[PDB]
Structure 1
Amino acid sequence: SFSGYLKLTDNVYIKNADIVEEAKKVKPTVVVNAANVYLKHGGGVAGALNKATNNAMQVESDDYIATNGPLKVGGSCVLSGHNLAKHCLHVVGPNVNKGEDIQLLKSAYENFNQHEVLLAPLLSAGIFGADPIHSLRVCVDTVRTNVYLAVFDKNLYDKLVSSFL
């Protein structure tokens, strides 16, 4: 189904790809969003996925927050995948740039175990400020379901693969 991924472990795969383009092509059952507790999809993966939905993700997310309140750091919710996937699993990894606890990254990845297969970014990486090498390590040590990681940055992808233990 997913093409061109490098197998890291029994269940973790990685590719240098734009997660928006991966989602449009594959139309996976689940695309993971690098969400914040307010589901305000301003930038990074969230801003990019929301822009690909023509803001439908943000409109749906605002209604979800109006009804349910904010998510917890380390938590998630399942919403529509719009034109990108059947569902979007909005997962909140800790944002180290907001001083959040990096220990919550394992809790964030545990949300992936509720889905047999997912297309996902590295949680807390990019604008969330965590070390992406550490994120990949927590991913491989926490996620047991099939996760296809899309890493937008080629230089970061090369660093992640070449340093993977």
Structure 2
Amino acid sequence: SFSGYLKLTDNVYIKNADIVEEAKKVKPTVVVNAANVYLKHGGGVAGALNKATNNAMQVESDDYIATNGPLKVGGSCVLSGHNLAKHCLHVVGPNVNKGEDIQLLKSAYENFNQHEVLLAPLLSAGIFGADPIHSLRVCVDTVRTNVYLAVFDKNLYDKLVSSFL
């Protein structure tokens, strides 16, 4: 079970944690990846999750893309969680640094509703360029299932908690 989380709402929890370390500890049913449409897990959360799988996530992902083509921005796919979780839900939030529509963040979070409980990062935060305070707001207002948010940066975590309405 998830430990050390602050309860934000009936179904949203938050912790200052490295999602890779959190996944290795909990081995949740679902870990969310901050994916891109190509499932190229180069940096940010995706790079870190993939490195923890010894690149097995990238090998599986390349086969998935070869068969299915790219995901949509706002879309997702379920792949193996490897050594981190039963499943990995690769969710594509809009990348503001790629000029993608921030309105797609709600669609991205809707993917979480297909899973009863998830360990997740804030979508479109970090290297995706969106405001993490906005991402948390969209998360709380969109996700109805039980979501355990791992925020790597302590300073951002404190800012998110202290500014949470």
TM-score (norm 2): 1.00
CA deviation map 1:3-58 (0-9, x unaligned): 00000000000000000000000000000000000000000000000000000000
Q: CA deviation at 1:159?
A: 0.2
CA–CA separation in structure 2 for the residues paired with 1:135 and 1:25:
25
Q: CA deviation at 1:133?
A: 0.1
Q: CA deviation at 1:79?
A: 0.0
CA–CA separation in structure 1 for the residues paired with 2:99 and 2:45:
20
Structure 1, unpaired ranges of 5+? none
Query: What SS class does the counterpart of residue 10 from structure 2 fall into?
Result: coil
CA–CA separation in structure 1 for the residues paired with 2:154 and 2:97:
23
Q: In the alignment, is residue 17 of structure 1 matched against residue 51 of structure 2?
A: no
CA–CA separation in structure 1 for the residues paired with 2:135 and 2:152:
15
Query: What SS class does the counterpart of residue 41 from structure 2 fall into?
Result: coil
Structure 2, unpaired ranges of 5+? none
RMSD: 0.1
Q: CA deviation at 1:114?
A: 0.0
CA deviation map 1:61-110 (0-9, x unaligned): 00000000000000000000000000000000000000000000000000
Q: CA deviation at 1:134?
A: 0.1
CA–CA separation in structure 1 for the residues paired with 2:156 and 2:59:
32
Query: What SS class does the counterpart of residue 40 from structure 1 fall into?
Result: coil
Runs of 4+ in 1 over 6 A off after TM superposition: none
CA–CA separation in structure 1 for the residues paired with 2:103 and 2:78:
23
CA deviation map 1:120-159 (0-9, x unaligned): 0000000000000000000000000000000000000000
